[PDB]
């Protein structure tokens, strides 16, 4: 019995050696391996395989998975593979071959009466994204991020207040407690950041004991060497992460003075290119250091013809500068530089910048972390060709390097990779299903802890779920007590030990951060480069080993006008 490869791909999705274009980009993935036994694929439907005594077995619930995603094309940092995925108790159980061991060979994912089916043939499955630069300006950001494929949000804020508009800080025990209570209502995993800017350590320990998983040092609260040293000393004691937005004004010192204050301790540098904030014009040189985990925020990704024009008039409204005063124009030409914006794209392609993030509603777009990551990968393929690590006639390595930037690398940086960040056994089943034509833009299904949380849904009164209008609507995984079971609130070790969850009557599942101080640049998956980088104080030119690092701005991008109504 034989089938043509074209008919096989139409029924079960692609197999080994077949290639798929990602959305409307020039990126092609090639299936590296396929865990099936040809002829034994499981398919659900009228007269299909998954039926009593056939592809479905006689086992009790304890001996089979709760959910199987059939014939998935997995794209993750470790491989691009065709396999079935099994989920049990809200966690990833196995990546392998599903079915009934009574009549089928090589079954590692048993399907029984207790198993639900998601048909993933012809779809791409990825881990849920992790955005670590959220400003909690409004709760509506959670649904916007979730629809985009982001399932964990780390950040700070109290709502639309001046402090939060500017910084990712949830200030003090009272607001930390209230925001942890509000977090139970949102269908994403959440961790909060406290205000790190203080020179008295007890004012920081109080915030960590209240529940924050990190501290943000922001220049708007004074990013001085004394405050940086204080926050890092506390972070080393309490195993939490520090995020930094450095002194753009060079008021307290230059970039080398900030780096000396850090003193080789682990830190996450936000918007490392610098438009989002930081020592002018050379904060970008921080990516050379082994203890620095560098991220980009998204408006500078990728460099386009309209980037500067929006950025030059963005900074003029944010800080109320006005183009009439010469000293404010000199300040505008200080955070906004064509030279560092263009270099940042290349540094992502080389693996010198390790994470992508939004900077939500505070010089960043909450629904565009994933889409912009892929637009940078596309523009780099077009300008630079194949990476040196690339094997075969495909972009598999570039794809693995870029997916790590919004999945596993933010998880490792924030001490939550034991729970989320990748499709690996034992991790929370936060999964995103994509049709290849809409990859990175509009997902087909977003799963939170084993339950569908949001999905495109057609007319509620229709005879099927596909008729128009189709728009994203919350599902059962986003409702009340089911939502509480399917999401995590992350706490510091001190807060968990002190019974913060019981005192505040938090309803969601709780997880604890760990391993924040031992992570270094060498641990960033596929993005561990420490370049010998310099920035010219006069021209702002970025050089790596004396070679100019630059790129050309795009006039048109993929994942843009073909897909969006506005």
């Amino acid at each position: 019995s034989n089938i043509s490869r074209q008919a096989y791909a139409d029924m079960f999705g692609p197999t080994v050696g077949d290639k798929v274009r990602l959305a409307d980009t020039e990126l092609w993935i090639e299936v590296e391996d396929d865990l099936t036994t040809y002829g034994e694929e499981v398919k659900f439907g009228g007269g299909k395989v998954i039926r009593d005594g056939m592809g479905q077995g006689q086992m009790l619930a304890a001996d089979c998975v709760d959910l199987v995603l059939t014939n998935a094309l997995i794209v993750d940092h470790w491989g691009i593979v065709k396999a079935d995925i099994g989920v049990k108790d809200g966690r990833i159980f196995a990546i392998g071959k599903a079915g009934n061991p009574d009549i089928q060979p090589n079954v590692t994912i048993p399907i029984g009466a207790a198993t639900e089916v998601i048909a993933a043939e012809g779809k791409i499955v990825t881990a849920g994204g992790i955005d670590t630069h959220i400003h909690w300006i409004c709760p509506q950001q959670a649904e916007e991020a979730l629809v985009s494929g982001v399932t964990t949000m780390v950040g700070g804020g109290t709502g639309p207040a001046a402090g939060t508009h500017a910084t990712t800080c949830t200030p003090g025990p009272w607001y930390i407690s209230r925001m942890l209570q509000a977090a139970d209502s949102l269908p994403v995993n959440i961790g909060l950041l406290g205000k790190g800017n203080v020179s008295q350590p007890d004012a920081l320990r109080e915030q960590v004991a209240a529940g924050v998983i990190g501290l943000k040092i922001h220049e708007d609260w004074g990013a001085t060497p004394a405050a940086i040293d204080c926050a890092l000393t506390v972070a080393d004691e309490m195993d939490i992460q520090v995020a930094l937005h450095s002194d753009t004004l060079n008021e307290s010192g230059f970039v080398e003075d900030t780096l000396a204050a850090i003193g080789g301790r682990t830190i996450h540098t936000f918007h490392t290119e610098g438009a989002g904030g930081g020592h002018a014009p050379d904060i970008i040189t921080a990516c050379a250091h082994p203890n620095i985990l560098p991220s980009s925020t998204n408006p500078t990704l990728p460099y386009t013809l309209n980037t500067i024009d929006e950025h030059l008039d963005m900074l003029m409204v944010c800080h109320h500068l006005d183009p009439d005063i010469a000293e404010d124009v000199a300040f505008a030409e200080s955070r906004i530089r064509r030279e560092t914006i263009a270099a940042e794209d290349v540094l992502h392609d080389l693996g010198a910048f390790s994470l992508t993030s939004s900077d939500s509603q505070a010089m960043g777009r909450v629904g565009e972390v994933i889409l912009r990551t892929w637009q940078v990968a596309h523009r780099m393929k077009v300008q630079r060709g194949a990476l040196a690590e690339e094997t075969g006639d495909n972009d598999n390595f570039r794809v693995k390097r870029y997916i790590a930037k919004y999945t596993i690398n933010p998880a490792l940086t924030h001490g939550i990779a034991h729970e989320v960040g990748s499709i690996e056994v034992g991790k929370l089943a936060d999964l995103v299903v994509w049709s290849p034509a809409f990859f990175g833009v509009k997902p087909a299904t977003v799963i939170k802890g084993g339950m569908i949380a949001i999905a495109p849904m057609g007319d509620i009164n229709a005879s099927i779920p596909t008729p128009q209008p189709v728009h994203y609507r919350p599902m059962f995984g986003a409702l009340g007590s089911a939502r509480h079971h399917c999401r995590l609130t992350f706490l510091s070790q001190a807060a968990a030990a002190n019974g913060v969850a019981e005192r505040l009557n938090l309803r969601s599942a709780i997880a604890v951060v760990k391993g924040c101080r031992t992570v270094q640049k060498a641990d960033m998956v596929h993005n561990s480069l420490q370049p010998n980088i310099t920035v010219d104080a006069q021209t702002y030119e970025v050089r790596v080993d004396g070679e100019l690092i630059t790129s050309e701005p795009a006039d048109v991008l993929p994942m843009a006008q073909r897909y969006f109504l506005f």
Binding site: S463, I464, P467, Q468, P469, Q561, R562, L565
Partner: protein, 100 residues
């Protein structure tokens, strides 16, 4: 009017079609959501006029051509489905390969 949720939901589809109608009038090549909205709204008005399901399954294939949409848009739309109140109640119209 005593609008039910399904009636309010169809107002969203009608509004999205107005956006597309105005862009097509300017001479733009339509994108994916604009094309879906425009064809869907045409079908709902055909049901209101009292056209049959069989007539609309055919007429819906002649609203937009490949020359009026962006590259790849026809392949992104293998079919369009929409329900509306015909004189004989709600019915489903499925238009196969609407853009050629």
């Amino acid at each position: 009017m005593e609008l039910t949720p399904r009636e309010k939901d169809k107002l969203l589809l009608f509004t999205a079609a107005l956006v597309a109608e105005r862009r097509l009038a300017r001479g733009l090549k339509l994108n994916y959501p604009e094309s879906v909205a425009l064809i869907s709204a045409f079908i709902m008005e055909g049901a209101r006029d009292g056209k049959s399901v069989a007539s609309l399954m055919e007429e819906g294939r002649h609203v937009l051509t490949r020359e009026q949409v962006m590259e790849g848009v026809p392949e992104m739309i293998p079919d369009i489905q929409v329900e509306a109140t015909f004189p004989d109640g709600s019915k489903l119209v499925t238009v196969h390969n609407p853009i050629i």
